[PDB]
Amino acid sequence: RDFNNLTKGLCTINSWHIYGKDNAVRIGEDSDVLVTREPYVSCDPDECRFYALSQGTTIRGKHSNGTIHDRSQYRALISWPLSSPPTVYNSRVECIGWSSTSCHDGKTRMSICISGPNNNASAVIWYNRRPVTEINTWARNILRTQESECVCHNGVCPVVFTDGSATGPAETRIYYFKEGKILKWEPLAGTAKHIEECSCYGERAEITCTCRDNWQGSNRPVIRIDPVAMTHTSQYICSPVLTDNPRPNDPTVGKCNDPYPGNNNNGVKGFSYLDGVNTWLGRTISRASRSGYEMLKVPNALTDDKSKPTQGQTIVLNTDWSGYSGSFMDYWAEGECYRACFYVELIRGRPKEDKVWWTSNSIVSMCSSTEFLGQWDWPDGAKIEYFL
Amino acid sequence: RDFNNLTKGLCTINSWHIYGKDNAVRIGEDSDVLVTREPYVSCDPDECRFYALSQGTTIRGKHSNGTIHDRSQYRALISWPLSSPPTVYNSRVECIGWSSTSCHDGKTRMSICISGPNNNASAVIWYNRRPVTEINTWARNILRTQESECVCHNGVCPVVFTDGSATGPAETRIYYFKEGKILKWEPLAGTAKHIEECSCYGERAEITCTCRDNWQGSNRPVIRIDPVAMTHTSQYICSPVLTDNPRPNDPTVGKCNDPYPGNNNNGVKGFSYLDGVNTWLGRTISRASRSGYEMLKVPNALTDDKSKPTQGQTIVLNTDWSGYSGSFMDYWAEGECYRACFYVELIRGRPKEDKVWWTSNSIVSMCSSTEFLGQWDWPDGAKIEYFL
Amino acid sequence: RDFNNLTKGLCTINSWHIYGKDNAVRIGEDSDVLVTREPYVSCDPDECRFYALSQGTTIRGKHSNGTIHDRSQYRALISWPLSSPPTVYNSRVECIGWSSTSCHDGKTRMSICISGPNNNASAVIWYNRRPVTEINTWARNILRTQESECVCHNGVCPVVFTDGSATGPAETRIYYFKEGKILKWEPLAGTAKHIEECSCYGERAEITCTCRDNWQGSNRPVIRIDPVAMTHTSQYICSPVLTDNPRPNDPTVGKCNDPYPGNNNNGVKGFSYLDGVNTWLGRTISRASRSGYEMLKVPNALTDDKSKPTQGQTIVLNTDWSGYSGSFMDYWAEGECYRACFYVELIRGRPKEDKVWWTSNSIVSMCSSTEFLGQWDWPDGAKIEYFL
Amino acid sequence: RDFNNLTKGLCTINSWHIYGKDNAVRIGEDSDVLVTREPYVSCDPDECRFYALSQGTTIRGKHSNGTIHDRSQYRALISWPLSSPPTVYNSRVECIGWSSTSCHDGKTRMSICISGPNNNASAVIWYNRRPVTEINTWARNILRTQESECVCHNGVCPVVFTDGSATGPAETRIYYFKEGKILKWEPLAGTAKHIEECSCYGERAEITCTCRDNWQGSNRPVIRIDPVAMTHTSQYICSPVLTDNPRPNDPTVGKCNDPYPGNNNNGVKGFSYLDGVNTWLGRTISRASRSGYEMLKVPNALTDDKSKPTQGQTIVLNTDWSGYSGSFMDYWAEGECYRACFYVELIRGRPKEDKVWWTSNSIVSMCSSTEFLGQWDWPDGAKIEYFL
Ligand SMILES: *[C@@H]1O[C@H](CO)[C@@H](O[C@@H]2O[C@H](CO)[C@@H](O[C@@H]3O[C@H](CO[C@H]4O[C@H](CO)[C@@H](O)[C@H](O)[C@@H]4O)[C@@H](O)[C@H](O[C@H]4O[C@H](CO)[C@@H](O)[C@H](O)[C@@H]4O[C@H]4O[C@H](CO)[C@@H](O)[C@H](O)[C@@H]4O[C@H]4O[C@H](CO)[C@@H](O)[C@H](O)[C@@H]4O)[C@@H]3O)[C@H](O)[C@H]2NC(C)=O)[C@H](O)[C@H]1NC(C)=O
Ligand SMILES: *[C@@H]1O[C@H](CO)[C@@H](O[C@@H]2O[C@H](CO)[C@@H](O[C@@H]3O[C@H](CO[C@H]4O[C@H](CO)[C@@H](O)[C@H](O)[C@@H]4O)[C@@H](O)[C@H](O[C@H]4O[C@H](CO)[C@@H](O)[C@H](O)[C@@H]4O[C@H]4O[C@H](CO)[C@@H](O)[C@H](O)[C@@H]4O[C@H]4O[C@H](CO)[C@@H](O)[C@H](O)[C@@H]4O)[C@@H]3O)[C@H](O)[C@H]2NC(C)=O)[C@H](O)[C@H]1NC(C)=O
Ligand SMILES: *[C@@H]1O[C@H](CO)[C@@H](O[C@@H]2O[C@H](CO)[C@@H](O[C@@H]3O[C@H](CO[C@H]4O[C@H](CO)[C@@H](O)[C@H](O)[C@@H]4O)[C@@H](O)[C@H](O[C@H]4O[C@H](CO)[C@@H](O)[C@H](O)[C@@H]4O[C@H]4O[C@H](CO)[C@@H](O)[C@H](O)[C@@H]4O[C@H]4O[C@H](CO)[C@@H](O)[C@H](O)[C@@H]4O)[C@@H]3O)[C@H](O)[C@H]2NC(C)=O)[C@H](O)[C@H]1NC(C)=O
Ligand SMILES: *[C@@H]1O[C@H](CO)[C@@H](O[C@@H]2O[C@H](CO)[C@@H](O[C@@H]3O[C@H](CO[C@H]4O[C@H](CO)[C@@H](O)[C@H](O)[C@@H]4O)[C@@H](O)[C@H](O[C@H]4O[C@H](CO)[C@@H](O)[C@H](O)[C@@H]4O[C@H]4O[C@H](CO)[C@@H](O)[C@H](O)[C@@H]4O[C@H]4O[C@H](CO)[C@@H](O)[C@H](O)[C@@H]4O)[C@@H]3O)[C@H](O)[C@H]2NC(C)=O)[C@H](O)[C@H]1NC(C)=O
Ligand SMILES: *[C@@H]1O[C@H](CO)[C@@H](O)[C@H](O)[C@H]1NC(C)=O
Ligand SMILES: *[C@@H]1O[C@H](CO)[C@@H](O)[C@H](O)[C@H]1NC(C)=O
Ligand SMILES: *[C@@H]1O[C@H](CO)[C@@H](O)[C@H](O)[C@H]1NC(C)=O
Ligand SMILES: *[C@@H]1O[C@H](CO)[C@@H](O)[C@H](O)[C@H]1NC(C)=O
Ligand SMILES: *[C@@H]1O[C@H](CO)[C@@H](O)[C@H](O)[C@H]1NC(C)=O
Ligand SMILES: *[C@@H]1O[C@H](CO)[C@@H](O)[C@H](O)[C@H]1NC(C)=O
Ligand SMILES: *[C@@H]1O[C@H](CO)[C@@H](O)[C@H](O)[C@H]1NC(C)=O
Ligand SMILES: *[C@@H]1O[C@H](CO)[C@@H](O)[C@H](O)[C@H]1NC(C)=O
Ligand SMILES: [Ca+2]
Ligand SMILES: [Ca+2]
Ligand SMILES: [Ca+2]
Ligand SMILES: [Ca+2]
Half-sphere exposure of B121 (CA within 13 A, CB side): 27
Q: Is A85:A31 a contact under the CB 8 Å cutoff? A: yes
A134 with B29: Cβ contact below 8 A: no
Burial C299-337 (b: 16+ CB within 10 A, else e): bbbbebbebebeeebebbebebbbbbbbbbbbbebeeee
A181 CB neighbour count, 10 Å cutoff = 10
Parallel, antiparallel or unpaired: strands C34-43 and C15-21: unpaired
A14 CB neighbour count, 10 Å cutoff = 14
Task: Compute φ and ψ for A228, nearest 5 degrees.
Answer: -85, -50
Of C323, C327, C314, whose CA–CA distance to C245 is shortest? C323
Q: Is D341:D329 a contact under the CB 8 Å cutoff? A: yes
Task: Compute φ and ψ for A80, nearest 5 degrees.
Answer: -150, 165
Of D312, D304, D311, whose CA–CA distance to D253 is shortest? D304
Task: Write out the DSSP string of D168-202.
Answer: S--EEEEEEEETTEEEEEEE--SS-----S-EEEE
Q: Is C338:C204 a contact under the CB 8 Å cutoff? A: no
A180 CB neighbour count, 10 Å cutoff = 19
CA dihedral B190, B196, B202, B206 (to 10 degrees): 20
Give residue B77's Cα distance to chain centre. Answer: 14
Burial C239-265 (b: 16+ CB within 10 A, else e): bbbbbbbbbeebbeebbeeebbebbee
CA distances from C163 to C34, C118, C196 (A): 29, 10, 9
The residue count for chain B: 388
Catalytic residues of D: 70, 324
Through-space distance between the first and last CA atoms of chain A, rounded to whole angstroms: 51
Burial D300-315 (b: 16+ CB within 10 A, else e): bbbebbebebeeebeb
Q: Is C114 left (phi over 0), alpha (psi -120 to 50) or beta?
A: beta
- Hey, which chains touch D, using 3+ CB pairs under 8 Å? A, C
Considering the candidates A40, A324, A338, A343, report the single residue annotated as catalytic.
A324
Q: CA–CA separation, A74 vs C153, rounded Å?
A: 55
B19 with A137: Cβ contact below 8 A: no
C9 is in an annotated binding site: no
Sign of CA pseudo-dihedral C245, C249, C250, C254: negative
Helices (DSSP H) in chain C: which residue ranges? 24-28
Residue B144's SS3 state is strand
D122 with A381: Cβ contact below 8 A: no
Q: Is A235:A41 a contact under the CB 8 Å cutoff? A: no
Distance C245 CA to ligand 15 centre (A): 7
Q: Is A272:A278 a contact under the CB 8 Å cutoff? A: no
Residue nearest to atom 24 of ligand 3 (CA): C310
DSSP state for residue C101 in the 8-state scheme? E
Of C314, D87, D231, whose CA–CA distance to B120 is shortest? C314
How many Å is the Cα radius of gyration of chain B? 19
Task: Write out the DSSP string of B96-112.
Answer: E-SEEEEEE-SSSEEEE
Parallel, antiparallel or unpaired: strands A122-127 and A130-136: antiparallel
Distance from CA of D127 to the nearest CA of A (A): 10
Q: Is C243 left (phi over 0), alpha (psi -120 to 50) or beta?
A: alpha
Question: Which of A84, A90, A332, A364 to mutate to test binding with chain D, by most D CBs within 10 Å of its CB?
Answer: A84
C89 with D85: Cβ contact below 8 A: no
D372 CB neighbour count, 10 Å cutoff = 12
Q: CA–CA separation, A206 vs C241, rounded Å?
A: 84
Q: CA–CA separation, B248 vs B259, rounded Å?
A: 12
Q: Chain C residues contacting D, CB < 8 Å?
A: 32, 56-58, 60-63, 73-74, 76, 88-89, 91-93, 96-97, 115-117, 119-122, 124, 129-132, 134-137
Q: CA–CA separation, A98 vs A55, rounded Å?
A: 9
B246 CB neighbour count, 10 Å cutoff = 17
CB of B22 sitting under 6 A from ligand 2: no
Q: CA–CA separation, C111 vs D83, rounded Å?
A: 15
Q: Is C192:C222 a contact under the CB 8 Å cutoff? A: yes
Q: CA–CA separation, D63 vs D42, rounded Å?
A: 29
Considering the candidates C324, C331, C338, C343, report the single residue annotated as catalytic.
C324
Please report, as a single letter, which amino acid is at residue B241: V
Q: Which residues of A touch B87 (CB under 8 A)?
A: 88-89
Q: Which residues pair with D124 in a beta bridge?
A: D113, D134
Q: CA–CA separation, B132 vs B95, rounded Å?
A: 12
Domains of chain B: 1-388 (2.120.10.10)
Q: Is A67:D128 a contact under the CB 8 Å cutoff? A: no
Chain C CA closest to residue B33: C31
Exposed/middle/buried for A5, CB within 10 Å: 0-12, 13-18, 19+? middle
Task: State chain B's maximal CA–CA distance in angstroms.
Answer: 56
Q: Is C151:C42 a contact under the CB 8 Å cutoff? A: no
Residue D51's SS3 state is strand
Which ligand neighbours the alpha carbon of B216 most closely? 14
Strands (E), A61-145: 76-81, 92-96, 99-104, 109-115, 122-127, 130-136, 144-145
Q: Is D155:D205 a contact under the CB 8 Å cutoff? A: no
CB of D3 sitting under 6 A from ligand 11: yes
Q: Is B53:B75 a contact under the CB 8 Å cutoff? A: yes
The resolution, in angstroms to one decimal, equals 2.3
Q: CA–CA separation, C274 vs C10, rounded Å?
A: 10
Q: CA–CA separation, B264 vs A305, rounded Å?
A: 80
- Point out the ligand 3 atom lying closest to the alpha carbon of residue C311: 71
D253 CB neighbour count, 10 Å cutoff = 9
Question: Which of D29, D87, D88 to mutate to test binding with chain A, by most A CBs within 10 Å of its CB?
Answer: D88
Parallel, antiparallel or unpaired: strands B99-104 and C130-136: unpaired
B140 CB neighbour count, 10 Å cutoff = 17
Q: Is D211:D192 a contact under the CB 8 Å cutoff? A: yes
Task: Write out the DSSP string of A165-211.
Answer: -SSS--EEEEEEEETTEEEEEEE--SS-----S-EEEEETTEEEEE-
Q: CA–CA separation, A288 vs D34, rounded Å?
A: 37
A88 with B87: Cβ contact below 8 A: yes
